[PDB]
């Protein structure tokens, strides 16, 4: 019963949501530039900053709704396309349906849009995490950094082109564009003075991996003059070229997606970055690397043993889990948790295009939401209690019961209770790893889910419980409606996404 | 006494010093303090083991405390720098070690005891605290200005900047009536 | 068993009371930073010991070359250093079982001829 109307509606929605975002950004930027001689806030109720905040927030939100609709259309379209290809067995019949483009808006960068489930999951993560982070950064943007209210819109446009393109070069360029806005945010919006050095560490560490990926892309392009991302089927790389490409790709994308030993920059940046931008970084900016690694390694044929890469990922997991205990800083502890989860996700991609990719994608989504939740809780603690250190913070539950309850439920979700996409992703990865290498699976599970979990829980429980006798004149009140509903939405997603259609998982 | 013997990673020597004398450094104490504290500790332990114990014998308790009292009277009479007094101190410290009981009863009136901190008592600062006017009336003028200071609004509890431009009723009349009237009068 | 006098090489804070530190690393903010004013903008004076602990680890550093091996326990340090090698060797030994049986092996399988998971493959007129 599938008809061409659904196909064209899917394509039109995907194409036009990008232009909706772009036109919103363009209008907002034109207003901002041409309303004032100097593009800084006027400290009065009639400033354009209020309009810009409104436009950014409710462009992201409306584009997120349209993205939900377009993602559902894509799911139907992909399912029915697979059915059309698979169903017919007659040799004379073949599915050759050709679509003509609309005459209203042009194709951005003269590229035909191609959408995949992983790309749309990444785009949904971008939308939601960007919404949370923009909601967080309101107190940070003041009177000279208001120009960074558009950072998340720029991120959304970059990610949209990144996930809706079938061109290798455009793919790589979109991946590399993410550096400038993130560096500028960390440099100009971070309150702490150590953020200045943290930004440089972030730039250099990420750029080393960017150069590695650039070398790999140069190898692919120079050898294969193609750029369509599908002509690689008709060209085979020799053993030496293939091993060089996989090594470069893995190391370069692991610089971004933190792997052992390349997580020093991540720890520094998470500790010294804005509490609202740490959410976006951990939640989304480390998963574009995973998506790019998946695309490249599934496109290239590799005839090498992945034991070395699996060992690197497992070593990162073990290192982060063991170090969890020794952190009294909640933000650094959450950063180590992010490193652990990202290393597990990266390990999920070490078997080419096997079924491990499904667990990897689900784990990427759950880690995004869980890291957003954890960093937002740390943000609330730091903002109301003027410290994010375990020695200075104690007995949160008895003065701010809602915040303590949020911490406890965050710990329960992090533990991986059944009924959560966290548990589902752990089940996928461990079920595969048990047959792949059962002893390695046992070691990984033991370390991560006992030693790292206990180290993680020690600090959070100590902060939540106790007796806050110190500085009774300065104790805060409670979570606000904004914070409470953000926490509730994170919990709601982590719980209900387990009912998403199992066809794609 | 803080009753923190089994917490804070005390060594055995430190715990023994805490039990015998209230301090962890008995050297700081003088002769009378040492003797009196050791006598009190010995009597407390003998009472714990031979009065509040398992099938305690009160006659034996009386005899034991009498002997201990005579010995401690002799100890107090003795000079601080005497090997006999040192032997007495070692004897009664050994007795304290012998009678040492893990999970010994700790009175609920002492710090670090079971039930010591079950409740958090709220201070008058928290009791007075009421940023909104439901319980304690809130002035429309947020604060009372003090002399030699400007009049500034108090910082709100929630400092979210997600605020729209000022909203006005639909079809709100906002013509500059004052200027219009003055211009009409001027002609 | 751990005591400050006899730990020797397993370092820890000394039990003896000490005077508060006169100078210690402190929170510092970017120039012209916008203050954080949540819940009435009430800031309490920070405890010197607590602030010192907050900023001590970030600034801690090794005094002389090779101190890392000796610090703590040499055996545990060597085991931690060799952990990646142990993991790789365990993976290879496990992969021997996979090779001899016929189960999943550590390789980049290429069942799909570059066809991404549930990708839209279409042509235009």
């Amino acid at each position: 019963m599938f008809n061409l109307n659904t196909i064209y509606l899917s394509r039109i929605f995907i194409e036009f949501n990008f232009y909706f975002l772009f036109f919103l950004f363009l209008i907002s930027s034109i207003i901002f530039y041409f309303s004032k001689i100097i593009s800084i806030q006027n400290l009065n109720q009639n400033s354009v900053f209020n309009f810009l905040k409104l436009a950014n927030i409710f462009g992201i939100l409306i584009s997120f709704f349209i993205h939900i609709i377009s993602f559902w259309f894509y799911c139907i379209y992909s399912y029915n396309l697979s059915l059309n290809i698979f169903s017919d067995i007659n040799l004379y019949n073949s599915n050759s349906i050709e679509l003509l483009n609309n005459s209203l808006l042009p194709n951005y960068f003269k590229s035909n849009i191609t959408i995949d489930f992983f790309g749309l999951i990444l785009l949904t993560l971008a939308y939601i995490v960007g919404f949370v982070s923009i909601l967080a950064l309101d107190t940070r943007l003041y009177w000279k950094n208001i120009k960074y209210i558009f950072s998340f819109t720029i991120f959304l446009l970059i990610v949209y082109v990144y996930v809706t393109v079938s061109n290798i070069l455009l793919f790589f360029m979109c991946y590399e564009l993410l550096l400038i806005p993130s560096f500028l945010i960390v440099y100009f919006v971070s309150p702490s003075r150590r953020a200045i050095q943290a930004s440089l560490y972030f730039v250099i560490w990420t750029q080393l991996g960017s150069l590695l990926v650039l070398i790999a892309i140069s190898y692919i392009i120079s050898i294969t003059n193609t750029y369509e991302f599908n002509d690689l089927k008709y060209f085979n790389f020799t053993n030496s070229e293939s091993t060089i490409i996989i090594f470069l790709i893995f190391l370069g994308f692991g610089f971004k997606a933190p792997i052992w030993p390349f997580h020093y920059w991540l720890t520094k940046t998470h500790v010294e970055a804005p509490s609202g931008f740490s959410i976006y970084l951990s939640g989304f900016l480390v998963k574009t690397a995973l998506y790019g690694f998946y695309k490249f390694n599934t496109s290239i044929f590799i005839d090498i043993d992945s034991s070395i890469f699996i060992a690197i990922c497992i070593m990162g997991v073990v290192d982060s889990s063991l170090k969890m205990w020794g952190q009294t800083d909640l933000k650094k502890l959450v950063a180590y948790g992010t490193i652990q989860e990202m290393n597990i996700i990266y390990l999920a991609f070490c078997w080419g295009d096997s079924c491990a990719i499904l667990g990897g994608i689900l784990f990427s989504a759950t880690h995004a939401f869980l890291s957003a939740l954890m960093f937002f809780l740390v943000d609330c603690i730091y903002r109301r209690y003027h410290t994010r250190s375990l020695v200075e913070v104690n007995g949160i539950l008895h003065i701010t019961p809602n915040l303590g309850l949020s911490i406890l439920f965050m710990l329960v979700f992090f533990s991986g209770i059944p009924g959560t996409i966290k548990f589902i992703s752990e089940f996928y990865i461990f079920s595969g790893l048990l047959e792949a290498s059962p002893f390695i699976c046992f070691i990984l599970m033991l370390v991560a889910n006992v030693l790292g979990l206990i180290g993680f829980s020690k600090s959070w429980f100590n902060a939540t419980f106790g007796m806050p006798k110190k500085n009774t004149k300065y104790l805060p009140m409670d979570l606000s409606f904004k914070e409470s509903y953000i926490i509730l939405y994170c919990f709601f997603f982590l719980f209900i996404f387990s009912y998403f259609s199992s066809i794609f998982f | 006494s803080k009753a923190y013997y089994f917490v804070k990673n005390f060594s055995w020597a430190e715990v023994s010093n805490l039990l015998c004398y209230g301090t962890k450094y008995p050297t700081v104490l003088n002769h009378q303090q040492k003797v009196t504290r050791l006598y009190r500790a010995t009597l407390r332990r003998v009472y714990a083991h031979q009065v509040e114990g398992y099938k305690t014998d009160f006659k034996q308790y009386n005899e034991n405390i009498t002997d201990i009292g005579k010995d401690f009277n002799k100890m107090l009479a003795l000079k601080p720098e005497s090997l006999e007094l040192q032997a007495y101190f070692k004897k009664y410290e050994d007795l304290q070690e012998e009678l040492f009981d893990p999970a010994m009863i700790i009175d609920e009136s002492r710090p670090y005891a079971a039930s010591s901190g079950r409740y958090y008592i709220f201070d008058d600062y928290l009791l007075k605290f009421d940023p909104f006017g439901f319980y304690s009336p809130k002035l429309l003028s947020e604060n009372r200005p003090e002399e030699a200071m400007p009049f500034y609004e108090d910082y709100p509890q929630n400092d979210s900047h997600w605020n729209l431009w000022e909203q006005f009723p639909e079809d709100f009349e906002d013509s500059n009536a004052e200027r219009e009237a003055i211009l009409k009068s001027n002609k | 068993n751990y005591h400050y006098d006899f730990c020797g090489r397993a370092y820890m804070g000394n039990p003896a009371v000490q005077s508060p530190p006169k100078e210690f690393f402190n929170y510092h903010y970017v120039p012209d930073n916008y203050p954080d004013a949540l819940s009435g903008f009430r800031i309490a004076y920070r405890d010197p010991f607590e602030v010192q602990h907050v900023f001590a680890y970030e600034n801690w550093e090794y005094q002389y070359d090779g101190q890392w091996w000796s610090m703590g326990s040499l055996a545990c340090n060597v085991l931690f250093f060799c952990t990646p090698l142990f993991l790789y060797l365990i993976l290879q030994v496990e992969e021997l079982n996979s090779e001899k049986r016929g189960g999943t092996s550590n390789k980049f399988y290429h069942n799909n001829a570059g066809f991404f998971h549930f990708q839209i493959y279409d042509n235009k007129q």
């Binding site: - | 409740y119 008592i121 | 370092y11 804070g13 009371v17 405890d47 010991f49 607590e50 801690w60």
Partner: peptide, 26 residues
């Protein structure tokens, strides 16, 4: 019988740090 004063704030005694919190005891 006696009218007791309201429960003492002393019941929870504020703890004042007198020793450095060693990073080796984190």
């Amino acid at each position: 019988g006696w009218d007791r004063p309201d429960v003492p704030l002393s019941f929870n005694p504020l703890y004042v740090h007198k020793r450095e919190l060693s990073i080796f005891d984190t």
